[PDB]
Amino acid sequence: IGKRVVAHTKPRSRTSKAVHEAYLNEMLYPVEVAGQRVHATLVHKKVANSKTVFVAVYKNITGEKVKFAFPV
RNA sequence: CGGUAAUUCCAGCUCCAAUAGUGUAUAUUAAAGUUGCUGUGAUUAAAACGCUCGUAGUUGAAUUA
């Protein structure tokens, strides 16, 4: 995996979205991501996003609690 | 309302409202969602330019941990 920094809001390559997108693709070589869905739901008067990397055909490096699965 | 049987005219009695106040005339505001920001209407009641291009004006997709 690569090692790039995330600035404080530097170019679009140094943004959180690009870093996580790059980390997701570089950590998943050669299997391909072909779908992402986020299922927001209310829990204890709070909103809990649950990102799901779908169609797989990370927490330590990035911090996103993302579940990986396969298409139905 | 009154053209011959007037609940409205000119009168008489009766009683209604307000009251040391009570009508008139003009004008401002509300009524008036009959000037619309909140808030109007435009087939037929008033009201979409004959149609297209177009500068000023107004309005402009998602995205940056």
CSV table of C-alpha atoms (C1' of nucleotides) in Angstrom, one decimal:
chain,number,residue,atom,x,y,z
A,1,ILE,CA,0.0,0.0,0.0
A,2,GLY,CA,1.1,3.6,-0.6
A,3,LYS,CA,1.7,6.2,2.0
A,4,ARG,CA,0.2,9.7,1.4
A,5,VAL,CA,-0.7,12.4,3.9
A,6,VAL,CA,-4.0,14.1,4.4
A,7,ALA,CA,-3.8,17.9,4.8
A,8,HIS,CA,-5.9,20.2,7.0
A,9,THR,CA,-8.6,22.3,5.3
A,10,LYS,CA,-3.4,21.0,-0.8
A,11,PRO,CA,-4.5,19.3,-4.0
A,12,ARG,CA,-7.3,16.8,-4.6
A,13,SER,CA,-4.8,14.0,-4.3
A,14,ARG,CA,-4.3,15.0,-0.7
A,15,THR,CA,-8.0,14.8,0.3
A,16,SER,CA,-9.7,12.3,2.5
A,17,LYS,CA,-12.0,11.0,-0.2
A,18,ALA,CA,-9.1,10.4,-2.6
A,19,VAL,CA,-6.8,8.8,0.0
A,20,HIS,CA,-9.5,6.3,1.1
A,21,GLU,CA,-10.4,5.6,-2.5
A,22,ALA,CA,-6.7,4.9,-3.2
A,23,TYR,CA,-6.2,2.8,-0.1
A,24,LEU,CA,-9.4,0.8,-0.8
A,25,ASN,CA,-8.2,0.0,-4.4
A,26,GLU,CA,-4.5,-0.5,-3.5
A,27,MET,CA,-5.3,-2.8,-0.5
A,28,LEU,CA,-7.8,-4.8,-2.6
A,29,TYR,CA,-5.6,-5.6,-5.6
A,30,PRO,CA,-6.4,-7.5,-7.7
A,31,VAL,CA,-10.1,-8.0,-6.6
A,32,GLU,CA,-12.3,-5.2,-7.9
A,33,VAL,CA,-14.8,-3.1,-6.1
A,34,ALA,CA,-18.0,-2.6,-8.1
A,35,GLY,CA,-20.4,-1.1,-5.7
A,36,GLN,CA,-20.7,1.0,-2.5
A,37,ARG,CA,-23.8,1.5,-0.4
A,38,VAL,CA,-24.3,3.4,2.9
A,39,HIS,CA,-27.3,2.4,5.0
A,40,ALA,CA,-28.0,5.2,7.5
A,41,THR,CA,-30.2,4.1,10.4
A,42,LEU,CA,-31.3,5.8,13.7
A,43,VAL,CA,-29.9,4.2,16.8
A,44,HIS,CA,-30.3,5.6,20.3
A,45,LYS,CA,-31.4,9.0,19.0
A,46,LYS,CA,-28.3,9.0,16.8
A,47,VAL,CA,-27.6,8.4,13.1
A,48,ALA,CA,-25.2,5.5,12.4
A,49,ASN,CA,-23.9,5.4,8.8
A,50,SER,CA,-22.9,1.8,7.8
A,51,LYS,CA,-20.7,2.0,4.7
A,52,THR,CA,-20.7,-1.3,2.7
A,53,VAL,CA,-18.2,-1.9,-0.1
A,54,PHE,CA,-20.4,-4.1,-2.4
A,55,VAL,CA,-19.6,-6.3,-5.4
A,56,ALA,CA,-16.1,-7.1,-4.2
A,57,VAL,CA,-15.3,-8.8,-7.6
A,58,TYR,CA,-8.8,-1.0,6.2
A,59,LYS,CA,-10.0,0.3,9.6
A,60,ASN,CA,-6.4,0.7,10.8
A,61,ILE,CA,-5.1,2.6,7.8
A,62,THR,CA,-8.2,4.7,7.1
A,63,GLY,CA,-10.7,4.5,9.9
A,64,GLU,CA,-13.9,3.6,8.0
A,65,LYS,CA,-15.9,0.7,9.5
A,66,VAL,CA,-16.8,-0.8,6.1
A,67,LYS,CA,-18.3,-4.2,5.6
A,68,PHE,CA,-17.3,-6.1,2.5
A,69,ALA,CA,-19.6,-8.5,0.8
A,70,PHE,CA,-20.8,-9.9,-2.6
A,71,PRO,CA,-23.8,-9.0,-4.8
A,72,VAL,CA,-27.0,-10.9,-4.1
B,1,C,C1',-90.8,53.0,-1.4
B,2,G,C1',-94.7,56.2,-3.7
B,3,G,C1',-100.1,55.8,-10.2
B,4,U,C1',-105.6,56.6,-4.5
B,5,A,C1',-105.9,50.6,1.4
B,6,A,C1',-97.6,53.8,1.3
B,7,U,C1',-94.7,49.1,7.3
B,8,U,C1',-89.9,53.8,4.0
B,9,C,C1',-93.2,60.4,1.8
B,10,C,C1',-95.2,64.8,5.2
B,11,A,C1',-97.3,64.1,10.2
B,12,G,C1',-99.4,62.3,15.6
B,13,C,C1',-98.5,58.3,19.6
B,14,U,C1',-95.4,54.2,20.7
B,15,C,C1',-89.7,52.3,21.3
B,16,C,C1',-84.5,51.4,19.4
B,17,A,C1',-79.2,53.0,19.8
B,18,A,C1',-75.7,56.4,22.0
B,19,U,C1',-75.4,59.9,25.6
B,20,A,C1',-73.4,65.4,27.2
B,21,G,C1',-73.0,63.8,23.3
B,22,U,C1',-74.9,62.8,18.6
B,23,G,C1',-75.3,63.1,12.5
B,24,U,C1',-73.4,65.1,8.0
B,25,A,C1',-69.2,66.2,4.1
B,26,U,C1',-64.0,65.3,2.8
B,27,A,C1',-59.5,62.7,3.5
B,28,U,C1',-55.8,58.5,6.1
B,29,U,C1',-55.9,53.1,8.1
B,30,A,C1',-58.4,48.3,8.6
B,31,A,C1',-62.1,45.7,5.8
B,32,A,C1',-58.6,44.8,0.8
B,33,G,C1',-55.9,37.5,-0.1
B,34,U,C1',-60.1,44.3,-4.6
B,35,U,C1',-51.9,45.8,-5.3
B,36,G,C1',-50.3,39.9,-3.8
B,37,C,C1',-42.6,39.6,0.3
B,38,U,C1',-46.0,36.7,3.8
B,39,G,C1',-50.4,36.9,-0.7
B,40,U,C1',-53.8,37.3,-5.9
B,41,G,C1',-55.4,36.2,-11.2
B,42,A,C1',-54.1,35.1,-16.7
B,43,U,C1',-58.6,28.0,-21.4
B,44,U,C1',-63.8,30.1,-21.0
B,45,A,C1',-65.0,36.1,-16.2
B,46,A,C1',-60.1,41.5,-17.1
B,47,A,C1',-55.4,39.3,-18.4
B,48,A,C1',-49.4,34.5,-22.0
B,49,C,C1',-45.9,39.0,-26.6
B,50,G,C1',-47.3,35.7,-33.7
B,51,C,C1',-42.6,33.0,-33.1
B,52,U,C1',-37.4,32.4,-32.6
B,53,C,C1',-32.2,34.7,-31.3
B,54,G,C1',-30.4,38.0,-27.5
B,55,U,C1',-27.2,42.0,-23.8
B,56,A,C1',-28.0,44.0,-18.9
B,57,G,C1',-30.9,41.6,-14.6
B,58,U,C1',-32.5,37.2,-11.9
B,59,U,C1',-31.3,32.0,-11.2
B,60,G,C1',-27.6,28.1,-11.6
B,61,A,C1',-25.7,19.7,-10.7
B,62,A,C1',-22.6,16.4,-7.3
B,63,U,C1',-17.7,16.9,-4.9
B,64,U,C1',-12.5,18.9,-0.7
B,65,A,C1',-12.3,15.4,7.4
